Amino acid sequence: TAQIVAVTASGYDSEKGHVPANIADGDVKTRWAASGESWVQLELDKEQSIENILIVPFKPTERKLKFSIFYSNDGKNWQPLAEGLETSSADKNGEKLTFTPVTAKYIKLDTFGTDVNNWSAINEIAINSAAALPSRAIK
Ligand SMILES: [Ca+2]
Numbered sequence: 001t002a003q004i005v006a007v008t009a010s011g012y013d014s015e016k017g018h019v020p021a022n023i024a025d026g027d028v029k030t031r032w033a034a035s036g037e038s039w040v041q042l043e044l045d046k047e048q049s050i051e052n053i054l055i056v057p058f059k060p061t062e063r064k065l066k067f068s069i070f071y072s073n074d075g076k077n078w079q080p081l082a083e084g085l086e087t088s089s090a091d092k093n094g095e096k097l098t099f100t101p102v103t104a105k106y107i108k109l110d111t112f113g114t115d116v117n118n119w120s121a122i123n124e125i126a127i128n129s130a131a132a133l134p135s136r137a138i139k
Contacts, residue, residue: 002127006043010034023125031058033121041108047073051101054129056094057087058121063114064089071104082138096129097138
């Protein structure tokens with residue numbers, strides 16, 4: 001997948017150590033988590049063509065995450081890839097979201113908690129992932 005060099009977030013669960021970098025560590029056992037309307041932003045090594053993102057939400061079969069995905073080349077001006085998504089509860093293991101390729105250095109998920117409570121929690125995110133996971137077109 002595309003190399004993430006930096007992760008930042010609106011906030012995180014500091015008591016439990018659910019830090020932003022947890023989203024990029026290739027470890028499904030760790031997670032970023034934050035409460036209320038939140039965001040996590042991934043910075044790629046370079047500006048490049050993007051065509052999918054893989055998201056492995058926390059407890060995906062019990063909780064659907066609401067979120068929107070934005071992209072930028074400058075970290076200040078954002079365009080939506082899609083707004084008002086929910087993750088799949090049918091997918092144990094994560095899903096890939098595909099779209100019309102765009103050029104981006106940054107990807108930001110604005111997150112709105114789940115259908116269960118106001119925590120947004122994500123185990124993994126990857127950009128241009130080749131994982132064998134199911135697979136849904138957005139916007
Ligand atoms: Ca992780």
